Amino acid sequence: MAGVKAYELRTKSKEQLASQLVDLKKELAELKVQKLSRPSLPKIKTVRKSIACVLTVINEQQREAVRQ
Amino acid sequence: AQKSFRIKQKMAKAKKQNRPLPQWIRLRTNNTIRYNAKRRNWRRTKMN
Amino acid sequence: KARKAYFTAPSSQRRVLLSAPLSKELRAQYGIKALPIRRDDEVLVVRGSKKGQEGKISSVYRLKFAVQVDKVTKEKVNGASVPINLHPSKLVITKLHLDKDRKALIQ
């Protein structure tokens, strides 16, 4: 997630890890709507790499799944 | 010349990297080498 | 020969090359040859011209191969201050910012 990882690793629904993801996303987007001078970004980078942490942690706990 | 993306995108890139040396890199604590060194001049070398 | 695995290796073994000797006191009490120069530590620049001069090794620019000592800094005749890159294994570990990890390591 934004951690951790050791965190996102558990355990809310696909419809829970959901608005976590959708959340971080509306983040990244607004985080862009900033776009104004500097720009650091810095936590655009943060929010991003995290966006993925979510994404990846999300595509495994549906895999070990298929693995049953 | 009403182009086609194939040659569009490319046209666009000519632009995107048609730019003078970055200047940060100039002081990367290592070396860096000066001058764009790859420098199309839409009047010297030419596209496709 | 090689000497490039040297002048071109990864931090994961650039610290352990950027190493440093321990204080007589330390090299007696704690009882270890030396170690992997650590940050919040303190030291006393042994044989370099900024000799005997002392203080804390704020940061260590490994990707510059050399560690820096807080107070000991290079002075601009131009109303400005700039650090004086110091070469680790030519100083002397006054006191170590001992941490459970660095601790354990003492073996």
Place this chain on the structure above:
Amino acid sequence: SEKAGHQTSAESWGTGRAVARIPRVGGGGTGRSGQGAFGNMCRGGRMFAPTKTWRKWNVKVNHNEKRYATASAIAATAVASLVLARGHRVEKIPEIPLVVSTDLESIQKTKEAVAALKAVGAHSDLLKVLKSKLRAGKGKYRNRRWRRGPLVVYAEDNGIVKALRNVPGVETANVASLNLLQLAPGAHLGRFVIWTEAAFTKLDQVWGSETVASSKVGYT
């Protein structure tokens, strides 16, 4: 490198342009390789010879000879009007050769050895090994950055008195070995033998499968 700069697809130009009948290449961009390559006289062309693996790299000498050889200069290790001038620095007791108690075939310690090999009177020389000025020619740049005269060589029988390893200059052997290099390296006649057990007393032990001989009477 076989592909030795006959790596261009270049030509001559048919006499008719002032230039000379050497291969040339290109065009265009720039100057070269529109120049003139594939040739010795030019730049980055074949060596003359152009060398090769195939050469006579190794050489062959005969036994009975490398024997009158190794021999010729076992017997240099005595008469040390030479073994003075051939390197090693001696006073060394009125005893050439100059043997050591068959103890040293053990001496599992360096100093106990070194130092021993020293009260054995070798100091004077075990030091010369220590005017070590560092090379010259570009040798350096290629893993050979040393230049230290030769030293003291102790003859074994049982082990390598390998305490004497890191010993700076002195070199150990055995009995039925010794390169006709070592036994007078500097490939000149004369080297120091701090000897040993059945060593001096049981060098020969000749044969082998034959050997030895010589003839000029009273060497006077």
Place this chain on the structure above:
Amino acid sequence: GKGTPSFGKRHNKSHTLCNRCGRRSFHVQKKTCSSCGYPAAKTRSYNWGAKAKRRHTTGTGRMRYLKHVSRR
């Protein structure tokens, strides 16, 4: 005539790049050439030092010391 005066007529082509490689090389009218002759491409080579080297995408067969030798 044969030269200058002509010459300045170049205005058709031998190119349109490719889809593989693409160093300008599909005989527009002929179709496919100068390297990956779409189709069967097979690089289409010979014996004369090319390169034709480049970067993969494999070398991750530094596995080996870890194939089923560290895959399981």
Place this chain on the structure above:
RNA sequence: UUGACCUCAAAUCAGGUAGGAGUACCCGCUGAACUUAAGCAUAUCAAUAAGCGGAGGAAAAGAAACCAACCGGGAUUGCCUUAGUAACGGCGAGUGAAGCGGCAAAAGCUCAAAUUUGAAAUCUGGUACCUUCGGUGCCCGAGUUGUAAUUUGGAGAGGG
């Protein structure tokens, strides 16, 4: 009117399969000239370069339809020899390999042809030490079925 036997297909209907790549070096096919002959055809160059189609960790070869005198020897492979010699040749220029000897590495073996027509094989399902499409089982179900076992250098006997 209703089953098969048989050649032939059609299925996105099930599941695998190949196809490209590629320095070296291995199996093939296919094939120059330049060159030397002080000419030039013969020929040499050369079973060489180029072209093409196939592998591998090597490949290929290998248990003789061999070498051999008597003497005898005993699958290949490699090396040292054999040997610049037997031969081949405008017998010119040039080609030019073998086989009891010393090494290196060592291995030997299975089919077809013979009977009791198969109780031997694919799967796919249920379950199984093996945790989902999967190492192998068992039972069972469709399918295969001139392809279950002794016997093959030497014979083991093959049968009694």
Place this chain on the structure above:
RNA sequence: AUAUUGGCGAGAGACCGAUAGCGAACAAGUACAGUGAUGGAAAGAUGAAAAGAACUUUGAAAAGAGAGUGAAAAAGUACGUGAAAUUGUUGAAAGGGAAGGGCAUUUGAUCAGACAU
């Protein structure tokens, strides 16, 4: 079965040392040339360390002159070393269509020895 060699890995060399060495020590199979296949380079080094130089001179400005940094700017990102062709300046000398040798000497310039105590 040293039965065969340049992709992985690692040892090493009387090998080259930047017009040598693979063409490529370097954003090199690059810049760049050719419709095309192909063809294809030049190019390393301030220092130990940027410590890369904050009045005044026009500044169009670029710089200069002093300044300051350093062990040195006879190290100024035109940066170790900096030969030669070749050019400037200072200094001397010689010249009636020409270049410059060779033997002897005059003159000027300059140098060593011999010092004899």
Place this chain on the structure above:
RNA sequence: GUCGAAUUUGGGUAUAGGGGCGAAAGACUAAUCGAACCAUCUAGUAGCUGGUUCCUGCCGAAGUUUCCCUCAGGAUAGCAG
């Protein structure tokens, strides 16, 4: 010179190397043509040209003999060290 017809010309297409195409010149075929261009064979060959790198000291020449598809080479004598 010709200037509405064997006209002029864009685009698209077709013919590629002893092969194309040619109201024929040996023309043209990417400035290339009495056989294109690129790479390779390939450092092709060379009885002919050119150059062939540091000192002094010694000795010191041939052009003529004979056989060659030798006539600028080579063998063979003879001269030399």
Place this chain on the structure above:
RNA sequence: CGUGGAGGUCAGUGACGAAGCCUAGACCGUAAGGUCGGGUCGAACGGCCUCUAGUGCAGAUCUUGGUGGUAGUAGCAAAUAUUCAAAUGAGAACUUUGAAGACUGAAGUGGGGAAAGGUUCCACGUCAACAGCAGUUGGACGUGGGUUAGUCGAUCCUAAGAGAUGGGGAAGCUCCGUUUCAAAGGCCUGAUUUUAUGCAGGCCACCAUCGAAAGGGAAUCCGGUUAAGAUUCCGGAACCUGG
């Protein structure tokens, strides 16, 4: 005599300065060469005995790099073609503005395009370079902006032509064939139908597809707008296509 390198030994030389470089300065060789001094720089290097080879240059119309005499020379000469004055600038023959004078005088030096070009377009900033004198100016350098569709075009169609598959030649890359060789190719309305899918019947090698920004070819125009677009954006007024 001299060179790169290897064995040796001289306990050789040296940051108090090793190489290399610079000297009508000194001395040794008959000479290859050698040795000092002095200036100079910066980390290495030599004598002797031997070993080794990519070991010595003036040439080869030699290689590559660099220079000069030629020489501030040749040269910078295609349309009558240019002028006053401001202004802006450190500086105007050349920049902008004004005025004057003259051209191209609709088969244009004007108003769009093709093909090719890629941002040269527009704004802003500013002159090392480039422009062949100059530069304040530019297409130049720096940072930013601007390409808006049911009706324009491409998309579909067929042209020469190119081309897979039914197959056939070739050791083979591949060659050859779309007009003379199962199952056809599918689709269709009705159909065995409560939404699969036979069937009633029909057309049936359709012998794949690619190939036109000038051919073929559904449907828009007027006005307004910008630093730079526009038959689109936006205003109004439309017509086509599919449902």
Place this chain on the structure above:
RNA sequence: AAACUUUCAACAACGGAUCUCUUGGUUCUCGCAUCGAUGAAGAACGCAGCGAAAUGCGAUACGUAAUGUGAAUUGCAGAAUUCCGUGAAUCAUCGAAUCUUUGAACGCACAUUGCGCCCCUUGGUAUUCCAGGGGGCAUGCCUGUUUGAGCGUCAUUU
């Protein structure tokens, strides 16, 4: 007499040789057995707060995960806001992932980002028309499965 001209001095100056430098090359030797339809080699086009390229990477884009190292900073200390005792960008990592548009290239094509067909699920709300997300349709052969073909041909209660 100068200018000029030559000549040799020193100083600059053109030029970049000589000297020493070496994260290259070159040749040696010794281990080792691996590409792809489970989509390779190769190509585009993109991805940093700031980036042109070399480099790494793929819309999870100089990187996600996971390990141990780590124990302390990375793109190491360019700046920069930067963030840290719950483990930071480094190594290893390939007992995980993501892997655009492609290429043996793949439903048809492909100088275009062009053109179809299924199945699932959303809007218009009648499945049959138009738009959204998900899954899918190459070929040659292997083997079984499953339907139908001939006057190849067997036998059946007619």
